[PDB]
Amino acid sequence: EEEKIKNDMLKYIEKDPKIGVWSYPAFLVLQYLYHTVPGFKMSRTAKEALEKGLKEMYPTLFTIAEKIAKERFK
Amino acid sequence: EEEKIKNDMLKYIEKDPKIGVWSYPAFLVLQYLYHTVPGFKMSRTAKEALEKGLKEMYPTLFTIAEKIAKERFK
Numbered sequence: 265e266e267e268k269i270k271n272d273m274l275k276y277i278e279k280d281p282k283i284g285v286w287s288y289p290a291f292l293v294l295q296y297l298y299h300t301v302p303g304f305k306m307s308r309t310a311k312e313a314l315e316k317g318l319k320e321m322y323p324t325l326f327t328i329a330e331k332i333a334k335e336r337f338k
Numbered sequence: 339e340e341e342k343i344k345n346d347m348l349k350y351i352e353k354d355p356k357i358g359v360w361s362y363p364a365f366l367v368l369q370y371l372y373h374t375v376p377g378f379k380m381s382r383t384a385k386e387a388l389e390k391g392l393k394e395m396y397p398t399l400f401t402i403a404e405k406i407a408k409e410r411f412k
Contacts, residue, residue, distance in 0.1 A: 273366045276366050277362070281359075281360050281365030282359075282360060283358070283360070283365055283384055284359075284384075285355075285358075285381070285385045286357070286385065287355055288404075289393075289400055289404040290389055290392050290400075291355030291356075292347045292351070292403035292406065293392060293400050293402075293403045294357065297396075299346065300346070307358065307359070310359055310392070311361045314391060315391070317387030317390030317392075318363075318364050318367060318391075321387060325370060325371070326364075329365075
């Protein structure tokens with residue numbers, strides 16, 4: 265169950281976590297903030313948005329993935 | 339105010355809304371679902387997650403961007 269998920273998720277660590285989104289509203293808001301407030305970390309806020317929404321949709325899987333990624337610190 | 343935002347957002351329509359996220363938890367959950375449930379629209383769910391989280395963080399800007407993008411239908 266849980267340990268079945270762990271092996272697959274560790275198989276997915278090996279790859280680059282590039283995630284691509286084609287979304288006009290999100291792009292417009294992010295670009296507006298980038299051009300309007302200096303120093304706006306557009307990519308960080310987009311990652312936060314993705315992580316927040318995805319954790320809300322799939323809380324258990326998101327927590328498992330976060331624990332596996334974190335506990336791969338050393 | 340609002341009409342100042344409209345001009346910039348219409349300036350940003352011209353570009354491709356490619357949004358890129360480098361996030362290990364979100365990547366792990368999305369790839370787990372892609373490999374585990376057939377027909378999983380990974381990109382659609384990632385876009386939904388980004389839109390949900392970003393609308394929660396910036397509801398007014400997200401609604402403005404969504405209205406501008408929608409009302410550019412014809």
